[PDB]
Amino acid sequence: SGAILREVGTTNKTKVSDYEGAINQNTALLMKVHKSNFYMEGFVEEVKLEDLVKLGHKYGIPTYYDAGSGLLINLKEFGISVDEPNFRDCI
Amino acid sequence: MKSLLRQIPQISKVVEIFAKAYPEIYVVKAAREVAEKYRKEIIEGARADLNGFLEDVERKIKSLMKPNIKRVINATGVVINTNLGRAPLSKDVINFISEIANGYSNLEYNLEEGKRGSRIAHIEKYLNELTGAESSFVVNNNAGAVFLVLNTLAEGKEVIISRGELVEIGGSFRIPDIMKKSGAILREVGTTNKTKVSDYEGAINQNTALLMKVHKSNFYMEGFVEEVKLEDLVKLGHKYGIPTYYDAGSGLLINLKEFGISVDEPNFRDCISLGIDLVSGSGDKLLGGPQAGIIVGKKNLIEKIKKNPIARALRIDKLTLSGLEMTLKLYFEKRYEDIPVIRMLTQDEKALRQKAKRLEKLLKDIPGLKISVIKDKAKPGGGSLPELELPTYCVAIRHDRLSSQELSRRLRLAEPPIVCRIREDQLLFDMRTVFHEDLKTIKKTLQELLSI
RNA sequence: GGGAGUAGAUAGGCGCUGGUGUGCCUCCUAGACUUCAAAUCUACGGUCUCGCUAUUUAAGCGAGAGGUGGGUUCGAUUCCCACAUACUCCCG
């Protein structure tokens, strides 16, 4: 892609501090990918989406979410209870 | 001010006005859109009447219930019409696509071994046979086909190309601008109108990783002009040990002189059997199939391209893949007439008048219509054959009431819509591109605009 | 207990709508009609409340609330936010 990759946190856990800590003059993007075809249980921490946006608007950095699943609507409306994100809500 | 807007009814109230008239969903959408257009028009003080409301709300409903993309009756006589969606598909293909999309299929699944398999594997069997190349591959479109070969084999290294072959096809594609983003360094040789072989051979060096030639598909040069022969560039490559990459663009799968049309347009089989290492082209041009970037050439190169992590972002969808296999199946069976684009251009001169006057027989009754059939020479190829000029019968029409300009306008707004040429206040209908079942739809749309 | 989702009336259950709310079904009461019953139909109807005249009560009349509060807006039942509550789903 031509973009330089700055990986923060660790496999199972990643707090907000990890993101905010690696920012600098070259940081042009804050990107989060949704684990679509796998999942981690046990000691595992993740950064709330709301917090990423807050961190972006603080330093003036754009936020890019690769949902992957491409869920167009809220899924709970159909009886299936999952936290799967969707465009409308994430936007 | 605040009384010229209180007027506008309630969305619950207009929803009622259309009980079974239209779906509740489409009604509320039209009411909102309409409710906002009257709030702003009265706020700026440009409306004193609201009677237009009820009539309008129903027009939005009638409009909002139709998809935007719509089949269009092409009367221009241009087979590869970049604007109208290039090469149209035969029913045979469209049903093969219909079936694979209906449910699950073995897209990335090899039924033999019961484990995942490459989806590009189904087709390539066909390409290698038809072209004669060692191996093949296919991606989204030729634009990307180019970008992939450059970033695969010339990222960071030089690529020599003639200064007369740096094209701008389409609105966003430009060899110089994409190759840049390709990571390859551009070495332009020769001059606009002329380019000998010495120009190519002169700019080679330690970084030269590719010799690339682009086919001027959407333009041509006449007058004092020189070009580098293909056999020459193959010779030059094999001398210094440099690969040859031809961007045919037209994606002509076969020799074209075999069908009566005499042109020099290059084709895969012939260009491959010439000594070129790689060749690419769009599937929706001279191949007559769905949009697809087609690459054929040496195996050691194809494998280098495939492994590139960018090929996954170009890998073709389930629709075009299937639809491309059935298009390729037709080519093996020599069912040439079955593929729209080949039939349209190789149609009998006799064949065209036969349809030219079968339409004129359907419009003699319609009121105020001045119908005449003229033999005109047009240029069929839009995105692949720039110089070609072939004879075809146009049924030139003219109404006393309305003018040619206004006529084209209403015809593009019809259902189905019809797009046609205009020449000296005489609307023209080239029969080279008109399907038979359209003739009946042509007459029924013209009688609805001049007698209404 | 911690999160999250679905949510909301001013007779009662469901659904809708940026036009000052409304449609379907039910209840109640009332009216119409019907030999009797049913059916049917209709209601700027209903709750709470407060206030006003009388004031034991009756009796007549007027107004506001949509879980609560706030905001946007010409107008919020609709939309945003905050807190509360109901139902459900996940975790300790």
Side-chain angles (χ1 to χ4, degrees):
Chain A
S1 149
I4 301 294
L5 166 68
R6 205 180 183 80
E7 47 240 293
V8 303
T10 63
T11 303
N12 61 314
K13 284 185 178 112
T14 308
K15 312 170 221 307
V16 158
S17 69
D18 299 341
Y19 279 121
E20 172 167 54
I23 293 184
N24 61 65
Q25 292 74 6
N26 231 4
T27 296
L29 195 71
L30 296 173
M31 167 190 207
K32 171 165 171 51
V33 163
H34 164 78
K35 295 152 302 310
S36 87
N37 70 320
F38 82 81
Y39 63 103
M40 296 175 286
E41 257 167 52
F43 292 77
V44 170
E45 215 185 329
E46 195 181 325
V47 188
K48 303 182 181 183
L49 266 173
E50 298 81 58
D51 295 307
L52 288 188
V53 172
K54 280 175 184 163
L55 184 55
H57 300 311
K58 169 183 182 183
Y59 291 94
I61 290 158
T63 48
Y64 167 61
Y65 195 66
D66 176 322
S69 49
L71 193 52
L72 184 53
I73 61 188
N74 181 306
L75 189 32
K76 295 183 176 178
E77 298 182 16
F78 301 82
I80 307 176
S81 181
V82 308
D83 290 2
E84 197 67 32
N86 46 86
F87 293 85
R88 170 170 287 288
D89 293 342
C90 289
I91 290 300
Chain B
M1 65 181 63
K2 189 182 171 178
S3 77
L4 302 187
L5 186 56
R6 260 190 217 285
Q7 313 276 297
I8 296 172
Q10 158 172 54
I11 295 172
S12 277
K13 284 193 176 180
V14 188
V15 153
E16 284 198 305
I17 294 184
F18 302 94
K20 189 177 177 179
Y22 301 105
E24 157 129 62
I25 57 179
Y26 279 111
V27 172
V28 183
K29 184 186 211 161
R32 288 179 196 169
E33 166 168 37
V34 178
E36 308 304 305
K37 177 184 172 183
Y38 281 77
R39 243 160 260 181
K40 180 192 176 184
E41 294 180 339
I42 297 163
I43 289 177
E44 306 185 330
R47 186 178 288 284
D49 190 7
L50 302 160
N51 282 324
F53 181 90
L54 287 169
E55 307 188 329
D56 284 323
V57 167
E58 181 191 57
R59 284 178 211 162
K60 267 303 171 181
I61 302 185
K62 290 178 178 180
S63 179
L64 302 179
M65 268 176 100
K66 306 174 176 174
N68 209 316
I69 297 183
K70 39 199 170 188
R71 170 197 294 288
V72 175
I73 301 176
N74 183 345
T76 64
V78 176
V79 199
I80 299 295
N81 201 316
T82 52
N83 304 318
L84 288 179
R86 298 166 180 180
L89 295 174
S90 45
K91 198 177 166 187
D92 289 282
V93 179
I94 310 182
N95 276 325
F96 185 74
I97 285 181
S98 174
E99 157 190 18
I100 302 304
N102 179 319
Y104 296 67
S105 50
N106 60 297
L107 201 57
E108 280 187 32
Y109 211 86
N110 176 342
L111 291 164
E112 292 296 299
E113 313 168 300
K115 300 176 193 176
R116 189 169 82 72
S118 186
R119 82 174 48 191
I120 310 292
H122 307 132
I123 301 311
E124 79 163 10
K125 292 194 162 186
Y126 291 108
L127 296 181
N128 290 310
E129 306 184 332
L130 313 190
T131 59
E134 270 177 40
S135 188
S136 46
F137 190 64
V138 176
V139 289
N140 194 48
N141 52 55
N142 192 57
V146 173
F147 177 90
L148 192 66
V149 167
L150 288 185
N151 167 288
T152 287
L153 308 166
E155 177 182 74
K157 290 177 100 176
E158 299 193 5
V159 179
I160 308 173
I161 191 175
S162 176
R163 299 191 182 226
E165 281 170 29
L166 295 194
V167 293
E168 172 169 318
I169 65 89
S172 237
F173 187 91
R174 295 178 133 188
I175 307 291
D177 290 6
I178 211 185
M179 187 173 302
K180 193 197 175 186
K181 278 292 186 178
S182 141
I185 309 179
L186 173 55
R187 194 76 181 66
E188 46 245 324
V189 308
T191 44
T192 309
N193 61 324
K194 289 174 185 174
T195 287
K196 308 181 210 322
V197 169
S198 42
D199 311 315
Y200 277 101
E201 178 158 28
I204 296 182
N205 50 80
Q206 306 287 304
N207 273 337
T208 292
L210 193 61
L211 279 189
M212 176 204 198
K213 180 179 185 74
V214 180
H215 161 60
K216 289 160 294 304
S217 70
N218 68 309
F219 84 83
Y220 64 75
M221 305 178 291
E222 273 184 34
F224 292 102
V225 168
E226 207 158 327
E227 164 188 8
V228 172
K229 293 189 166 193
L230 296 185
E231 297 91 60
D232 282 323
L233 283 167
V234 186
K235 288 182 186 174
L236 175 62
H238 297 308
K239 183 190 178 191
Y240 292 84
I242 292 176
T244 60
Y245 168 57
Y246 191 57
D247 173 23
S250 65
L252 180 46
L253 186 43
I254 58 186
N255 195 314
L256 195 52
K257 296 184 176 181
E258 283 177 40
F259 302 97
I261 320 173
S262 176
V263 301
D264 297 337
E265 202 76 11
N267 64 70
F268 290 76
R269 165 168 296 290
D270 284 9
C271 272
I272 279 302
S273 41
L274 280 179
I276 308 173
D277 301 275
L278 281 197
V279 187
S280 72
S282 298
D284 67 316
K285 280 174 188 173
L286 300 186
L287 184 139
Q291 167 180 306
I294 288 164
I295 300 168
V296 304
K298 297 297 177 184
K299 188 169 180 302
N300 56 58
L301 286 161
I302 296 305
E303 305 307 315
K304 268 191 180 180
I305 298 177
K306 295 175 172 176
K307 295 182 185 178
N308 186 311
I310 301 178
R312 164 76 171 93
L314 292 182
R315 194 187 54 198
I316 45 200
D317 51 282
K318 181 181 58 200
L319 303 178
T320 57
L321 169 52
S322 52
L324 186 55
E325 160 159 60
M326 192 62 192
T327 302
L328 282 164
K329 186 173 172 290
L330 300 182
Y331 264 110
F332 190 95
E333 304 178 4
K334 302 303 170 191
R335 301 169 58 171
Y336 296 107
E337 68 279 6
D338 263 16
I339 61 179
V341 190
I342 276 271
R343 176 177 42 67
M344 304 174 137
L345 292 158
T346 58
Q347 257 183 176
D348 288 286
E349 182 179 306
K350 302 181 180 177
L352 298 177
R353 186 190 183 127
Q354 173 175 26
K355 191 159 57 185
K357 300 189 66 58
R358 184 187 103 66
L359 168 59
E360 166 179 60
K361 174 185 183 178
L362 294 168
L363 305 185
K364 284 174 191 172
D365 313 315
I366 303 178
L369 290 187
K370 291 193 161 192
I371 302 161
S372 75
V373 171
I374 68 176
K375 182 196 190 76
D376 193 46
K377 287 171 61 180
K379 308 186 176 184
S384 67
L385 294 142
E387 302 205 40
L388 186 86
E389 192 162 295
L390 295 186
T392 186
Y393 297 95
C394 305
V395 172
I397 60 177
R398 191 187 181 191
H399 193 237
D400 46 27
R401 292 183 43 232
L402 307 156
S403 73
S404 67
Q405 309 302 283
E406 178 58 19
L407 184 62
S408 278
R409 194 204 76 74
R410 286 196 202 183
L411 273 184
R412 314 207 302 278
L413 295 164
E415 289 174 34
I418 314 177
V419 184
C420 59
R421 289 180 173 291
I422 294 186
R423 292 177 176 295
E424 190 72 20
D425 189 47
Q426 194 185 52
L427 201 77
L428 300 176
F429 283 66
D430 193 317
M431 295 284 101
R432 169 90 76 182
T433 58
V434 186
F435 294 86
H436 294 290
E437 75 269 355
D438 291 327
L439 297 173
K440 297 181 123 58
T441 297
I442 293 176
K443 175 186 174 180
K444 189 173 185 279
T445 290
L446 290 177
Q447 65 183 41
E448 290 180 359
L449 308 156
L450 301 177
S451 273
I452 185 182

